[PDB]
Amino acid sequence: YHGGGSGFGGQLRSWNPPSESVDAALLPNFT
Amino acid sequence: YHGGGSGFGGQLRSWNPPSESVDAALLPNFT
Amino acid sequence: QEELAAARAALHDLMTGKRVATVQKDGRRVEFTATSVSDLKKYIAELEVQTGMTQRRRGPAGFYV
Amino acid sequence: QEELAAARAALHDLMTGKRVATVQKDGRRVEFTATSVSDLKKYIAELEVQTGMTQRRRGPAGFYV
Amino acid sequence: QEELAAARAALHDLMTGKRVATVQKDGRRVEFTATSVSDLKKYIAELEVQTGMTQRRRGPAGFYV
Amino acid sequence: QEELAAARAALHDLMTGKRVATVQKDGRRVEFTATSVSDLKKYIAELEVQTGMTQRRRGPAGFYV
Amino acid sequence: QEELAAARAALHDLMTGKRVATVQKDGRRVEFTATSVSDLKKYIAELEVQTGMTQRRRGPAGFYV
Amino acid sequence: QKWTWIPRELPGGRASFIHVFEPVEDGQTRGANVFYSVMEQMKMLDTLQNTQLQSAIVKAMYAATIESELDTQSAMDFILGANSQAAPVRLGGAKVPHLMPGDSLNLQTAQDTDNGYSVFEQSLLRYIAAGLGVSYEQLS
Amino acid sequence: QLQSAIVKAMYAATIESELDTQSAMDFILGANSQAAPVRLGGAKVPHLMPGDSLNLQTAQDTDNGYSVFEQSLLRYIAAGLGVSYEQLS
Amino acid sequence: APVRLGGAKVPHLMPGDSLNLQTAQDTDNGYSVFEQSLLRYIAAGLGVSYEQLS
């Protein structure tokens, strides 16, 4: 699976979104 | 969520609208 | 580098008008080749980049809304 | 800077007509190379920018209704 | 400024035909570089704009019915 | 203005063929720079506009049916 | 290599203005041909590439998000 | 400012405070607006629209250009046709000026006012309508 | 593409002159010094000396084939996800 | 140095200065038709219809 991989030529190397709940993503910047 | 974030390349860094009621936004410049 | 001061002095001499093309005294006579301003400026700039004593160039600009 | 005054004087001499290309006296003879007007103007402009004693350039304009 | 009067006199001398390019007397000989008319006119224009002693340029026109 | 007469005389001399480029007498020798006809004509016309002693130019024409 | 140092010295002499085109002394007289700056720069570049004493060129860039 | 405690339900079981939203995941205290999907694109498209409108106004403003060595008042008097009795020019009629060798008249031409902006706007509007859920025709 | 379009559309024109910036904008653009804002009211015809110059910039097509490439990518994405192309795009 | 996108700008350039707006080729210069041909070939190979596959 290339979903978790580096990418085609390594283009998605910096794309490492954090794994977090919906509250952790929403609440800090709700307002 | 990138709605409250800085943006794609940081283009929305200066876009910080204040959080205010409708009265606070409307009344000062009603006339 | 001691090759930057000489180039700067040569550029100033060429600009002010003290660069000599030919020198003659009775029989003796010497003639020197002439170079363009753009080539001297490019040489000076590239030698500055080699030395690195200062930073005069930066990366591309960026935009935000 | 002490170059800027020399560059200004050289430009004035070139414009008025007192820049000398060749000097000869009996056996002795010296000839100096010549430079363009635009190159001298660019040299003076960049030298003014480096010194920063005055401000002759500004940012782009803006429009409103 | 005293540069503007000299520039005007040089322009008049060049137009009439009294600008000296080369002068010689026995062994002695001196040669002066020559400049184009357009550059001298631009020099005089920018010099008189800097002085501001008069106003010869104005803003763009406007139209009405 | 006393410049207009000199410019007119210079133009007439250039046209007829009495404008001198170089003058030599034994050791003595002087050489004067040469200018184009169009530049002299433009100088003369612009100096006439400055003087205003006559009116040789008018506004654009108009049409009617 | 000992050719690279000579080429660098020749480039510096040409830039500063100490390259000799013609030298004369009484009857004796020698004249040397002149070469352009770009050809000398290309010569120095290829000579330094052949030596390999440093590395100044690299492969093409790559992009990532 | 002051804060007040309002219980969700009265002791008798009556509903005192009402909160309606659709949860996405297991633990979600409060809901998220629908604009998060297309928030950035709408702002950037608004900026593009304003910039394009200003650019069109600027490029349409400068109709012509005068080149001459005379005084600016004289140049407009002899070429543009203004009256000095900078200088306004009357729009009545058609004019044919007379130019000396040094004089010049240049009528400026401008780029197409809408050069493909409509198609890009269409694409962005389709994206926004997909994000919001309304139809493209209704939104645009 | 959106950022590039905004950047290219932003620079409407360009002034070239040997005078000061304030003088150049006053004489050519029409700003008032009484950098320098310019009022958009009306149409203007500046006068230029030989040194001066006015250039109106021309930009590329705002959407030069981006839409069709987007269509192809959206078809690929809709095929991957299983929803119809019309529904997705 | 960041640049703010708000507004329209008209810079002033000295003789040595310059400003060039880059132009780019068409984003999809016939890639769609070539992809169409390759997708027809693939659909023929697999057995599903071209419309269903693409």
XYZ file of C-alpha atoms in Angstrom:
670
model
C 0.000 0.000 0.000
C 1.362 3.380 -1.091
C -1.069 5.214 1.185
C 1.352 5.172 4.103
C 4.395 5.230 1.852
C 6.685 8.022 0.745
C 4.840 8.469 -2.564
C 5.531 8.197 -6.275
C 8.927 9.897 -6.288
C 8.912 10.716 -2.601
C 6.510 13.638 -3.020
C 4.361 12.742 0.018
C 7.347 12.531 2.379
C 6.315 15.641 4.327
C 2.595 14.756 4.378
C 2.335 13.254 7.880
C -0.945 14.458 9.412
C -1.350 13.677 13.119
C -3.781 10.985 14.226
C -6.213 12.610 16.649
C -9.848 12.676 17.697
C -12.365 15.129 16.268
C -12.263 17.168 19.486
C -8.477 17.567 19.331
C -8.750 18.846 15.754
C -11.798 21.070 16.239
C -11.676 22.618 19.714
C -8.279 24.447 19.591
C -9.418 26.641 16.669
C -13.203 26.586 17.167
C -13.710 30.330 17.629
C -8.903 21.390 10.216
C -7.308 24.093 8.065
C -10.178 26.536 8.607
C -8.532 27.843 11.764
C -5.038 27.076 10.521
C -2.443 29.185 8.760
C -3.416 27.986 5.270
C -1.886 26.171 2.322
C 1.414 28.050 2.241
C 0.526 30.425 5.044
C -1.620 32.678 2.854
C -4.380 32.933 5.492
C -1.985 34.029 8.247
C -3.354 37.581 8.408
C -7.008 36.531 8.006
C -8.079 36.780 11.664
C -11.615 38.210 11.754
C -12.763 39.110 15.273
C -15.410 37.037 17.027
C -18.277 39.401 17.809
C -22.053 39.554 17.968
C -24.173 40.958 15.153
C -24.736 44.170 17.124
C -21.007 44.792 17.595
C -20.440 44.385 13.851
C -23.495 46.268 12.589
C -24.124 49.191 14.946
C -20.770 51.083 14.683
C -21.224 51.648 10.925
C -25.022 51.456 10.589
C -25.603 54.943 9.174
C 40.122 38.051 -1.050
C 42.808 40.187 -2.608
C 41.274 39.686 -5.971
C 38.129 41.600 -5.031
C 39.902 44.841 -4.113
C 41.825 44.836 -7.398
C 38.648 44.223 -9.408
C 36.808 46.996 -7.548
C 39.680 49.415 -8.173
C 39.746 48.465 -11.863
C 35.996 49.075 -12.143
C 36.340 52.474 -10.471
C 39.256 53.411 -12.742
C 37.275 52.396 -15.829
C 34.246 54.403 -14.676
C 36.159 57.565 -13.760
C 38.274 57.379 -16.916
C 41.769 56.522 -15.622
C 42.076 53.131 -17.337
C 44.973 53.354 -19.793
C 44.855 51.673 -23.197
C 48.265 52.562 -24.661
C 51.448 53.932 -23.085
C 54.255 55.344 -25.231
C 57.560 57.082 -24.496
C 59.784 57.649 -27.560
C 60.625 54.150 -28.859
C 58.965 52.209 -26.046
C 55.259 51.498 -26.533
C 52.858 49.048 -24.859
C 49.189 48.367 -25.633
C 46.703 46.589 -23.360
C 43.460 44.871 -24.331
C 40.125 46.316 -23.218
C 37.178 44.530 -21.615
C 33.494 45.381 -21.367
C 31.732 46.745 -18.295
C 29.211 43.896 -18.074
C 31.936 41.237 -17.986
C 33.770 43.063 -15.192
C 30.542 43.450 -13.201
C 29.748 39.745 -13.622
C 33.285 38.821 -12.546
C 33.018 41.033 -9.461
C 29.597 39.677 -8.477
C 30.598 36.038 -8.966
C 33.784 36.546 -6.949
C 31.662 38.096 -4.189
C 29.468 34.983 -4.204
C 32.595 32.821 -3.929
C 33.974 34.808 -0.984
C 30.740 34.884 1.016
C 31.876 37.801 3.191
C 28.360 39.272 2.883
C 24.937 38.186 1.629
C 23.403 40.236 -1.185
C 21.105 37.626 -2.776
C 18.067 35.857 -1.322
C 15.444 33.363 -2.411
C 12.196 34.060 -4.249
C 9.430 36.060 -2.621
C 6.127 34.776 -1.284
C 2.542 35.979 -1.217
C -0.249 35.924 1.357
C -3.756 37.338 1.643
C 31.093 57.993 -0.067
C 34.153 59.281 -1.837
C 33.424 57.440 -4.972
C 30.065 59.040 -5.541
C 31.565 62.533 -5.780
C 34.175 61.319 -8.272
C 31.488 59.604 -10.360
C 29.350 62.760 -10.362
C 32.334 64.872 -11.422
C 33.192 62.400 -14.193
C 29.607 62.494 -15.472
C 29.613 66.298 -15.467
C 32.959 66.407 -17.290
C 31.702 63.941 -19.904
C 28.474 65.897 -20.450
C 30.112 69.331 -20.637
C 32.916 68.105 -22.896
C 36.091 68.000 -20.765
C 36.667 64.233 -20.664
C 40.065 63.611 -22.259
C 40.673 60.536 -24.407
C 44.250 61.177 -25.567
C 47.106 63.265 -24.159
C 50.285 63.760 -26.191
C 53.365 65.936 -25.691
C 56.379 65.342 -27.975
C 57.443 61.702 -27.474
C 55.133 60.978 -24.546
C 51.591 59.839 -25.345
C 48.889 58.348 -23.105
C 45.435 57.182 -24.208
C 42.527 56.322 -21.909
C 39.612 54.035 -22.732
C 36.075 55.409 -22.971
C 32.869 54.300 -21.262
C 29.211 54.722 -22.156
C 26.882 57.283 -20.596
C 24.257 54.721 -19.566
C 26.839 52.597 -17.743
C 28.049 55.638 -15.792
C 24.464 56.581 -14.921
C 23.784 53.045 -13.673
C 27.006 53.119 -11.638
C 26.000 56.416 -10.021
C 22.475 55.144 -9.325
C 23.647 51.941 -7.643
C 26.269 53.884 -5.679
C 23.531 56.224 -4.435
C 21.405 53.221 -3.457
C 24.288 51.633 -1.530
C 25.079 54.810 0.422
C 21.457 55.390 1.421
C 22.005 59.047 2.349
C 18.809 59.958 0.456
C 15.724 58.147 -0.840
C 14.917 58.533 -4.536
C 12.932 55.316 -5.113
C 9.610 54.177 -3.659
C 7.194 51.276 -3.871
C 4.450 50.666 -6.422
C 1.376 52.866 -6.512
C -2.143 52.051 -5.384
C -5.625 52.895 -6.593
C -8.950 53.775 -4.986
C -12.340 55.046 -6.108
C 22.468 75.412 -10.038
C 25.751 76.087 -11.760
C 25.641 72.835 -13.538
C 22.515 73.732 -15.466
C 24.031 76.892 -16.958
C 27.134 74.976 -18.052
C 24.981 72.253 -19.619
C 22.901 74.840 -21.494
C 26.058 76.553 -22.757
C 27.505 73.210 -23.880
C 24.280 72.391 -25.737
C 24.340 75.769 -27.487
C 28.008 75.331 -28.432
C 27.308 71.861 -29.834
C 24.305 73.119 -31.819
C 26.089 76.154 -33.274
C 29.239 74.151 -33.999
C 31.860 75.499 -31.562
C 32.419 72.267 -29.615
C 36.088 71.292 -29.897
C 36.881 67.626 -30.491
C 40.656 67.880 -30.985
C 43.115 70.747 -30.528
C 46.752 70.550 -31.630
C 49.742 72.904 -31.541
C 53.134 71.542 -32.680
C 53.909 68.546 -30.429
C 51.091 69.238 -27.975
C 47.778 67.545 -28.763
C 44.672 66.779 -26.685
C 41.552 64.876 -27.765
C 38.182 64.992 -25.991
C 35.393 62.424 -26.132
C 32.072 63.334 -27.746
C 28.530 62.667 -26.544
C 25.207 62.471 -28.351
C 22.604 65.235 -28.370
C 19.835 63.133 -26.812
C 21.907 62.294 -23.730
C 22.722 65.976 -23.203
C 19.044 66.895 -23.555
C 18.077 64.227 -21.012
C 20.791 65.488 -18.653
C 19.508 69.064 -18.913
C 15.907 67.919 -18.431
C 16.631 65.909 -15.287
C 18.877 68.671 -13.928
C 16.161 71.303 -14.364
C 13.584 68.978 -12.799
C 15.866 68.545 -9.774
C 16.304 72.310 -9.365
C 12.575 73.030 -9.571
C 13.168 76.693 -10.444
C 10.247 76.411 -12.899
C 7.564 73.845 -13.734
C 7.416 72.501 -17.290
C 5.655 69.152 -16.725
C 2.077 68.566 -15.586
C -0.286 65.694 -14.896
C -2.350 63.774 -17.442
C -5.335 65.356 -19.142
C -9.006 64.862 -18.375
C -12.123 64.746 -20.513
C -15.667 66.067 -20.168
C -18.719 66.383 -22.394
C 16.223 85.812 -28.417
C 19.810 86.062 -29.480
C 20.135 82.374 -29.741
C 17.555 82.038 -32.472
C 19.552 84.188 -34.899
C 22.712 82.163 -34.249
C 20.867 78.873 -34.777
C 19.291 80.153 -38.004
C 22.686 81.293 -39.294
C 24.219 77.922 -38.392
C 21.444 76.098 -40.261
C 21.941 78.297 -43.324
C 25.713 77.760 -43.222
C 25.246 73.991 -42.948
C 22.805 73.945 -45.875
C 24.858 76.176 -48.180
C 28.136 74.432 -47.364
C 30.137 76.925 -45.267
C 30.153 74.956 -42.003
C 33.776 74.102 -41.227
C 34.806 70.804 -39.652
C 38.583 71.222 -39.285
C 40.905 74.230 -39.530
C 44.665 73.830 -39.932
C 47.545 76.269 -40.423
C 51.028 74.694 -40.219
C 51.288 73.311 -36.661
C 47.996 74.758 -35.433
C 44.969 72.521 -35.990
C 41.459 72.500 -34.494
C 38.587 70.087 -35.157
C 34.915 70.630 -34.301
C 32.190 68.034 -33.813
C 29.337 67.771 -36.311
C 25.603 67.552 -35.638
C 22.702 66.259 -37.702
C 20.191 68.398 -39.580
C 17.142 66.984 -37.783
C 18.546 67.830 -34.345
C 19.270 71.414 -35.408
C 15.771 71.777 -36.871
C 14.205 70.427 -33.674
C 16.328 72.798 -31.577
C 15.293 75.761 -33.729
C 11.594 74.860 -33.629
C 11.563 74.261 -29.871
C 13.376 77.547 -29.238
C 10.766 79.282 -31.409
C 8.033 77.758 -29.246
C 9.831 79.035 -26.138
C 10.150 82.572 -27.517
C 6.544 82.876 -28.686
C 7.308 85.796 -31.018
C 5.005 84.199 -33.622
C 2.447 81.387 -33.771
C 3.165 78.594 -36.251
C 1.239 75.720 -34.621
C -2.493 75.332 -33.998
C -4.880 72.778 -32.559
C -6.474 69.824 -34.337
C -8.933 70.355 -37.160
C -12.683 69.833 -37.086
C -15.311 68.486 -39.451
C -18.863 69.488 -40.346
C -21.467 68.411 -42.880
C 46.954 20.892 -13.071
C 49.365 23.609 -14.078
C 47.204 24.707 -16.885
C 44.371 25.716 -14.600
C 46.525 28.112 -12.565
C 47.839 29.742 -15.744
C 44.297 30.103 -17.103
C 43.103 31.679 -13.843
C 46.038 34.106 -13.866
C 45.339 35.024 -17.500
C 41.676 35.660 -16.679
C 42.638 37.894 -13.754
C 45.139 39.808 -15.903
C 42.523 40.324 -18.620
C 39.924 41.498 -16.089
C 42.252 43.915 -14.285
C 43.707 45.198 -17.555
C 47.314 43.928 -17.606
C 47.000 41.722 -20.701
C 49.483 42.913 -23.329
C 48.297 43.083 -26.933
C 51.355 44.727 -28.513
C 54.824 45.529 -27.168
C 57.358 47.620 -29.092
C 60.905 48.843 -28.459
C 62.701 50.681 -31.296
C 62.782 48.279 -34.275
C 61.608 45.253 -32.297
C 57.841 44.735 -32.216
C 55.657 41.735 -31.329
C 51.864 41.459 -31.536
C 49.729 38.804 -29.832
C 46.224 37.678 -30.755
C 43.338 38.368 -28.378
C 40.564 36.026 -27.254
C 37.110 36.693 -25.848
C 36.192 36.400 -22.177
C 33.500 33.750 -22.684
C 35.896 31.338 -24.399
C 38.394 31.713 -21.549
C 35.644 31.093 -18.986
C 34.540 27.960 -20.852
C 38.160 26.781 -21.026
C 38.594 27.256 -17.273
C 35.283 25.515 -16.555
C 36.090 22.442 -18.644
C 39.641 22.318 -17.272
C 38.390 22.388 -13.675
C 35.804 19.723 -14.513
C 38.540 17.473 -15.929
C 40.725 17.882 -12.832
C 37.887 17.086 -10.427
C 39.711 18.702 -7.497
C 36.329 20.077 -6.355
C 32.678 19.618 -7.326
C 30.728 22.684 -8.455
C 27.971 21.053 -10.542
C 25.150 18.807 -9.336
C 22.161 16.959 -10.736
C 18.724 18.413 -11.451
C 16.372 19.362 -8.645
C 13.379 17.466 -7.323
C 10.029 18.524 -5.924
C 7.809 17.362 -3.069
C 4.664 18.587 -1.339
C -18.805 39.450 31.813
C -20.539 36.703 33.800
C -21.412 33.043 33.253
C -24.608 31.244 34.281
C -25.181 27.539 34.913
C -28.151 26.164 32.961
C -28.887 22.447 33.510
C -29.887 20.426 30.469
C -33.015 18.984 32.094
C -35.221 19.899 35.032
C -35.512 17.400 37.916
C -38.966 16.413 36.655
C -37.575 15.287 33.296
C -38.526 18.383 31.297
C -36.055 19.596 28.662
C -34.596 22.933 29.754
C -31.763 23.429 27.240
C -31.808 22.154 23.650
C -28.700 21.292 21.615
C -29.063 19.840 18.105
C -26.103 18.799 15.954
C -24.863 15.782 14.049
C -21.829 14.020 15.564
C -19.116 12.767 13.219
C -17.017 10.558 15.518
C -17.334 8.875 18.905
C -16.460 11.770 21.199
C -17.549 15.160 19.850
C -18.699 17.878 22.244
C -19.720 20.467 19.632
C -20.342 20.432 15.910
C -18.321 21.765 12.995
C -19.582 24.220 10.392
C -19.916 23.156 6.763
C -17.569 25.890 5.525
C -14.385 24.120 6.692
C -14.333 22.144 3.438
C -14.276 25.236 1.197
C -13.333 28.106 3.534
C -9.948 28.882 1.970
C -11.091 28.674 -1.655
C -13.941 31.161 -1.202
C -11.658 33.783 0.356
C -8.986 33.279 -2.298
C -11.585 33.507 -5.084
C -12.944 36.738 -3.593
C -9.407 38.138 -3.552
C -8.950 37.071 -7.183
C -12.231 38.708 -8.214
C -11.372 42.007 -6.524
C -7.847 42.019 -7.973
C -9.120 41.260 -11.485
C -11.740 44.013 -11.262
C -9.178 46.574 -10.085
C -6.741 45.500 -12.812
C -9.418 45.843 -15.493
C -10.343 49.320 -14.244
C -6.679 50.373 -14.228
C -5.951 49.020 -17.714
C -9.103 50.638 -19.110
C -8.297 54.033 -17.585
C -5.273 54.982 -19.724
C -6.659 55.661 -23.185
C -3.676 57.252 -24.941
C -0.168 58.648 -24.530
C 1.468 61.906 -25.657
C 5.174 62.122 -26.515
C 6.787 65.498 -27.196
C 9.653 67.764 -26.171
C 7.581 70.925 -25.637
C 5.894 72.169 -22.486
C 3.088 69.923 -21.285
C 0.456 72.648 -21.671
C 1.634 73.399 -25.217
C 1.801 69.685 -26.049
C -1.836 69.157 -25.063
C -2.892 72.399 -26.758
C -1.357 71.425 -30.097
C -2.089 67.676 -30.030
C -4.913 66.797 -27.634
C -6.835 69.997 -28.358
C -7.319 71.311 -24.819
C -7.985 75.021 -24.309
C -5.787 76.977 -21.897
C -8.114 80.004 -21.734
C -3.988 69.567 -16.006
C -6.142 70.880 -18.848
C -9.651 69.554 -19.591
C -10.494 68.349 -23.102
C -14.014 68.566 -24.510
C -15.500 65.352 -25.891
C -17.454 67.079 -28.655
C -16.423 66.138 -32.170
C -13.624 64.297 -33.947
C -10.124 65.757 -34.201
C -7.115 65.281 -36.490
C -3.972 66.741 -34.868
C -0.859 67.908 -36.700
C 2.464 66.584 -35.403
C 6.022 67.780 -35.921
C 8.819 65.197 -36.318
C 9.484 65.113 -32.573
C 5.808 64.781 -31.671
C 3.934 61.481 -31.381
C 0.448 60.157 -30.613
C -0.120 56.600 -29.367
C -3.530 55.002 -28.820
C -3.076 52.278 -26.218
C -4.613 48.831 -26.588
C -5.499 46.638 -23.621
C -5.772 42.909 -23.069
C -9.104 41.108 -23.125
C -11.087 42.213 -20.080
C -12.290 38.682 -19.256
C -9.534 36.396 -20.554
C -10.577 33.000 -19.248
C -11.555 34.242 -15.787
C -15.081 32.929 -16.379
C -13.971 29.306 -16.816
C -11.761 29.354 -13.718
C -14.616 30.932 -11.763
C -16.879 28.146 -13.040
C -14.466 25.475 -11.801
C -14.118 27.101 -8.375
C -17.894 27.541 -8.110
C -18.434 23.862 -8.919
C -15.934 22.976 -6.189
C -17.693 25.268 -3.699
C -21.129 23.884 -4.591
C -19.803 20.351 -4.121
C -18.448 21.326 -0.708
C -21.591 23.092 0.503
C -24.028 20.553 -0.961
C -26.202 22.925 -2.997
C -26.452 22.563 -6.761
C -24.003 24.418 -8.986
C -26.788 26.207 -10.868
C -28.456 27.366 -7.649
C -25.198 28.657 -6.161
C -23.769 30.356 -9.251
C -2.964 27.895 -9.959
C -5.201 30.213 -7.926
C -2.217 31.965 -6.335
C -0.491 32.283 -9.718
C -3.606 33.795 -11.297
C -3.925 36.323 -8.468
C -0.240 37.260 -8.745
C -0.329 37.661 -12.531
C -3.544 39.697 -12.442
C -2.229 41.969 -9.685
C 0.441 43.826 -11.703
C -1.603 45.951 -14.085
C 1.095 48.200 -15.556
C 4.696 49.375 -15.243
C 6.378 52.797 -15.144
C 9.861 53.351 -16.582
C 11.609 56.696 -16.116
C 14.862 58.261 -14.948
C 13.216 60.747 -12.568
C 12.259 60.332 -8.926
C 9.464 57.892 -8.146
C 7.194 60.627 -6.780
C 7.813 62.823 -9.829
C 7.325 59.875 -12.189
C 4.006 58.904 -10.603
C 2.814 62.520 -10.507
C 3.652 63.196 -14.154
C 2.687 59.827 -15.674
C 0.194 58.014 -13.436
C -1.540 61.162 -12.195
C -1.200 60.768 -8.426
C -1.384 63.804 -6.142
C 1.403 64.540 -3.656
C -0.517 67.325 -1.880
C 3.576 55.133 -2.144
C 1.158 57.599 -3.736
C -2.540 56.722 -4.137
C -4.225 57.303 -7.501
C -7.938 58.027 -7.825
C -9.747 55.797 -10.315
C -12.177 58.477 -11.481
C -12.016 59.320 -15.166
C -9.762 58.561 -18.122
C -6.252 59.992 -18.402
C -3.760 60.701 -21.201
C -0.243 61.335 -19.833
C 2.544 63.233 -21.576
C 5.961 61.576 -21.778
C 9.419 62.942 -22.499
C 11.776 60.748 -24.569
C 13.141 59.037 -21.456
C 9.700 58.213 -20.073
C 7.706 55.118 -21.034
C 4.346 53.523 -20.210
C 3.651 49.792 -20.541
C 0.329 48.019 -19.998
C 0.937 44.421 -18.957
C -0.706 41.506 -20.748
C -1.219 38.282 -18.814
C -1.718 34.708 -19.951
C -5.115 33.038 -20.101
C -6.466 32.703 -16.565
C -7.759 29.161 -17.192
C -5.495 27.750 -19.912
C -6.502 24.106 -20.063
C -6.668 23.577 -16.299
C -10.355 22.650 -16.521
C -9.869 19.631 -18.798
C -7.011 18.242 -16.701
C -9.204 18.712 -13.629
C -11.964 16.824 -15.451
C -9.643 13.891 -16.156
C -8.410 13.767 -12.558
C -11.985 13.976 -11.255
C -13.006 11.084 -13.507
C -10.108 9.052 -12.106
C -11.078 9.936 -8.522
C -14.754 9.113 -9.106
C -13.742 5.769 -10.606
C -11.624 5.077 -7.530
C -14.286 6.039 -4.990
C -17.172 4.387 -6.850
C -19.471 7.404 -7.168
C -20.521 8.777 -10.542
C -18.414 11.510 -12.122
C -21.352 13.925 -12.373
C -22.261 13.410 -8.711
C -18.678 13.934 -7.544
C -17.759 16.933 -9.703
C 10.004 38.953 1.937
C 6.231 38.342 1.981
C 4.026 40.352 -0.383
C 0.404 41.210 0.375
C -2.082 40.304 -2.351
C -4.475 43.132 -1.506
C -4.866 45.611 -4.337
C -3.310 46.368 -7.710
C 0.225 47.723 -8.077
C 2.100 49.700 -10.743
C 5.858 49.607 -10.029
C 8.374 52.157 -11.284
C 11.524 50.785 -12.916
C 14.887 52.377 -13.629
C 16.595 51.521 -16.945
C 18.462 48.568 -15.438
C 15.354 47.136 -13.789
C 12.851 44.774 -15.414
C 9.669 42.840 -14.624
C 8.595 39.773 -16.610
C 5.312 37.893 -16.193
C 5.867 34.241 -17.073
C 3.553 32.438 -19.477
C 2.999 28.691 -19.273
C 1.977 26.042 -21.767
C -1.520 24.584 -21.809
C -2.044 22.517 -18.666
C -3.612 19.629 -20.608
C -2.030 19.630 -24.074
C -3.685 16.551 -25.528
C -3.046 14.333 -22.506
C -6.792 13.659 -22.354
C -6.941 12.064 -25.814
C -3.886 9.876 -25.193
C -5.387 8.789 -21.872
C -8.603 7.995 -23.751
C -6.748 5.746 -26.199
C -4.857 3.960 -23.421
C -8.070 3.482 -21.429
C -9.785 1.984 -24.475
C -6.860 -0.425 -24.828
C -7.001 -1.351 -21.130
C -10.777 -1.859 -21.199
C -10.393 -4.085 -24.259
C -7.749 -6.106 -22.429
C -9.723 -6.529 -19.207
C -13.138 -7.087 -20.807
C -15.166 -4.314 -19.165
C -16.680 -1.589 -21.318
C -14.714 1.603 -21.912
C -17.416 3.794 -20.358
C -17.590 1.682 -17.195
C -13.813 1.574 -16.734
C -13.126 5.236 -17.505
